[PDB]
Symmetry: T
Subunit: 142 residues, 12 copies
């Protein structure tokens, strides 16, 4: 179902939320201030997705996963490991975003196949959002 | 340590964050709109605590817990079981808040004993905050 | 005199101010939040009237009553009444407003008769204000 | 033509506009304030659609229907009947929204078939909007 | 009754609302932008009147007409015929406003006669509003 | 005519505008700052009246006087002899306001007699405005 | 009890509210404007305290006094005899504030003794507030 | 003296103020709205100049002219001229602005010669302002 | 590639940016103010497109053209020729927009064919934007 | 050098900053509130100058003095002896401002002579600023 | 002519606008975010200059260059070559700004010589602006 | 006395104010912009403390030190130190903050001992503030 695509999104984003807080809290170096900031911007966005998506499946008669327990057993995002570097962190969520772009494309496919371009449009937005981030994060590194 | 009091706070608040979203998403009845709203207000506040507290222990040389995994193994808050009632939900977090008031009083005790009224002050604020909520939540029911 | 009409208004509104706070503080039930709010809106309005009217008689050479003592001995609004219901409270100030509409019409009569449509206009405004409230309050009940 | 899909939207929304005012004005009960409010929110949105859609067909060389007379002979929304209940009203427009989701899907079909995903995108938005409302309205009831 | 004066106002304004949208949508010429704008300003105002008036009669125990059907059988405003001119449109609603000034004066008469200067005051405001418009609209032409 | 009452208002206010600037510029003493300010507040208000009134007579088919020349030959306000005192200035415009209250009452009389309570309402507002000022100005002195 | 300390605060502040309005209305002299203003600032603050405190005792299971009648029989603030001086008024509430500082210190003592530094913190704030005012009020005089 | 240059500015601007109101009030045609607006923008600007300049000479020990009487006997700006065209009006103040540019250049000359580039700078600003207007006004015509 | 579609957009928009400034600067007539304004609105929008598009191709691994030199050798928009009329200018960019709608449709085709509805969505937006403008610009003329 | 003129400005303003705080803190009398305020306004302005000037010399390759030590050995402003009068304070900084006008004129001379009208322009602004203050301060006294 | 100085400014700024976008888009490294931002700030400012200057010459009877074609054949700014470094870019526009300071000084010379300190003042501002930037840009490097 | 603790705070903060400006002005490197900014944020905060503390001792009958002269002879903060590194500066005030935490703890001790938890609370706030900064500053380095 599409509800499953969405529910995995919920789980993933929920993980990102915490993971971004971690990086928000543990980042260090001459890029502290700028990165401390960026991550808060990112988890704020993550929180937005969590509610929209949930309310989306909620709008299509689905039941959104709503326990960290479930999130953990369904999310494919690997939580923080600590000790990460400032660059490590940027590198880390950047990969996370990219690995999510694929799951999204797949998600729009099935959404469209289940005659639900509405949900597809929602997903398309997130896709556009992350793609821009990936570029800036990448440019920060490369 | 005080860091432990704070880190349990972080874990508890993190759980509340998700639990409040759950109620935000699953609430029903003629109190929908007003309760759908209130819960969002509450998880927004919860998110504030998560960062202040974390950054507090972070300011006192501690290392904030930052994985849902840890949160789950340390929080004392019961993750939402489904199918609750609108009143059930209100009743539910109301109890959660009250059970937290006690842990807070204890938390200020030790904070003060460890010569740290700063952290105690932080905790005192949350206490005041929840007490008001408990009253309003309670008055909503009783 | 017109000053007497106005001074009774002052007294009445002053009582309403406190009475609305009481209801603001003691209301209970599933209408808590919405009614807790409405009453604050109402006593805020009441406070507005208290100053305009006072400053009105003050603008027409009068001397505004300014002690709770006098208010009590001149206001015709009940007050107190502790164990009141949420509906009881709505029902209560709704009647208070209606009983004030009459005193207002009378007040505009004498204001006009004393060649003071200015004060009449001021009173007319309050009249319009209360009439709308009465309707909403009433619709809330009926 | 697509212009016809849009023009029916215009008519429908125009009806909703008035119908929502009716409910805005005639609603009663302990849900007054909250529902009095919600309906105004809804007719404000309806008014938005009326202008966008009109200006859309206007942008694609069409001529928007612009008389209540025509609206009445083309809209499929059944105007108010009075006597409705607070729940009745919520139940009423909720059904109206759902019956409009179908007409929209159909509308996007033909839009796409006439090589106009632009108009389809416009319609898709309204679809998403109503779907969320339907859920909240529904949750209010069920 | 006064309720009848008001209800005709509601009907008239409701018609103006649509008629102003029509002109908003169909206007053309070097005065497009400025007139496209002005009409939107005007139908926004019209919508304000619709609700105030309705809520007025609603505040005086009346029942506001709330169907386009009734509006059509009671309004005295001519629904826009198409093909008008930019000047034609300005000329058109300008006359509409003037024809309304008379009905208003009459309306205040009866309002006053029925001991209701409140409603008269409401009507007086609209009068003042339209008179200014008529002048500007007129000056635009003459 | 009523146009004559209004046109005298225009002239008077126009004079006040300049006279208030004079006091704004020439005031001195320990009340400088507070009075320097108050006068600017007053001439700003004066400017408001000049336009409303003008546009009022303009709305009732009249032709507003629009030359300082005419203003001078029709206004009854005493231009500012120079060298006044801070108290003198306050005392000065206070008298001007009071002398205008009378002309206003007269103005509303004729407005009403000419079946124009609209203009009367406009004038009524100014009356209310000045009466308050007079009190504050007076209290400043007495 | 602490509830009694708070309830006396409520009563005192309620009296201050009216007493400050009195001074707001009856003040005179070259300090009119500045003092007319200051008092309004003060009674606005007073109103804030009335609600916080009430809602505080309300949060700790207490029942806030809510009738002017009770206020009068419990407040220790001297209602305003009439005819005071501008300086008299400043001198008057300044003393009132100082006499309240003592009751507050006492209030924090018992709050702390009853293991309620929360309420103590609330009271501490008011203390800080008044102390600053006292200085400015004093400096205004001395 | 420089005070004389400035005082003529004051007088001129004062005249412009009224003259712009006249045009604001008597303009007509298809350019009504846009010109009705522009003139108000212009007299608002004029009022700004009147106070800055006055306060400028006031800052350099001068005494600003402050009576319409003096303004009339010193200003070089025409005034009156009733039956003027929309274009006539634009053409009219445009010439007024240009004739002021010359007086300004002269004014900066003497200001500089009297070792007062401060006043010169002030004047320079107005110059720049008017030059832009002249262009737009001109482009409106040509 | 899609990058080529986007890069031509960049070039085109960059040209429009300058061309719109030209019209912004050289426009004349009784439509000056309104058209002077509109063009600034348009080049502001153009600038928006330039950055979004660039950053879009930048997000899809492309390299955005970034020299006026390249813009000139790739854009299909014909720069201004001066001497244009107010109507000429409106007529001019109106055609430019329409000629761009076609290039856009083509652009979405290839975007979709290269499995990139993201970019297609971006382009779709611009399409909708221009279509509305074309209508208003057209209505201004016809 | 010009850097020396600027650096003396920095020192002077730095002294003013503290001196204005002193007056802000020690002022007394019936002018307390208004003067308490004015001084804060002034030291806020002073702080602005300190940074602009510093950053100015910083922009012209200079090195801004940045220690209170240096400020003291170079500033020509008389630190505040204690116990001044309210009028004394006003009189005090007023003289300080005037004594600075001269140093500024001199400063613009050398700035211009060193082919740096940029810095001169900066200084010119401060000059204009202080001149206005001097007048108001003076008018407050005289 | 002065028009020529200004028109070269227009051309130069126009080039800077694009060149700054280039750097905005192609910058990379740990300074990405901060520099990506700064450049946008800079091209925003550049765009401001383009219009002010153009409108300046437009105000002095000149005809502003308005084609990228002309810009290219008259600007002295080197269009970005690709592959620069983050530092390279900063170094690059920093030099551009400095090379512009000289052309500006020359520009004010001739402006002054042609009796046009107005335009000189305009140019002086830009000078001040760039000088500050150069310092910050420089400090970023050195 | 407590006044002495506070007065040292005043002196210290006053020094910090200047010292932070120095760093604000002399910082260099790839961290320029971000550090140039941070320091301004810090001295703005410092200025806040200077006034609160002063006004605090002022509220407790004390007399705040108010001359740079005294500041210098009582502050324990270094100052000067010209050729400092970007990191050096961060390292520098970070140590300053930490050395202030100790003086603050001591300060709260004596405040509490002198029965003044009010002042203690004020100090507690600053403590919390600095502790957070120290962490961020530290994380920036380590
Ligand atoms: Fe939500
Ligand atoms: Fe944070
Ligand atoms: Fe008041
Ligand atoms: Fe529209
Ligand atoms: Fe309504
Ligand atoms: Fe006007
Ligand atoms: Fe409350
Ligand atoms: Fe002024
Ligand atoms: Fe960008
Ligand atoms: Fe700075
Ligand atoms: Fe422009
Ligand atoms: Fe202060």
């Amino acid at each position: 179902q599409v509800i499953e695509v969405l529910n995995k999104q919920v789980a993933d984003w929920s993980v990102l939320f915490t993971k971004l807080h971690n990086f928000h809290w543990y980042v260090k170096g001459p890029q502290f201030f700028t990165l401390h900031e960026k991550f808060e911007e990112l988890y704020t966005e993550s929180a937005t997705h969590i509610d929209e998506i949930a309310e989306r499946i909620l709008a299509i008669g689905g039941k959104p996963v709503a326990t960290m327990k479930e999130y953990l057993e369904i999310s494919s995002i690997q939580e923080a490991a600590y000790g990460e570097t400032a660059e490590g962190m940027v590198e880390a969520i950047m990969k996370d975003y990219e690995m999510m772009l694929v799951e999204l494309k797949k998600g729009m496919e099935i959404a469209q196949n289940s005659d639900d371009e509405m949900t597809s449009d929602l997903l398309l937005g997130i896709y556009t959002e992350l793609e821009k981030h990936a570029w800036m994060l990448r440019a920060f590194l490369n």
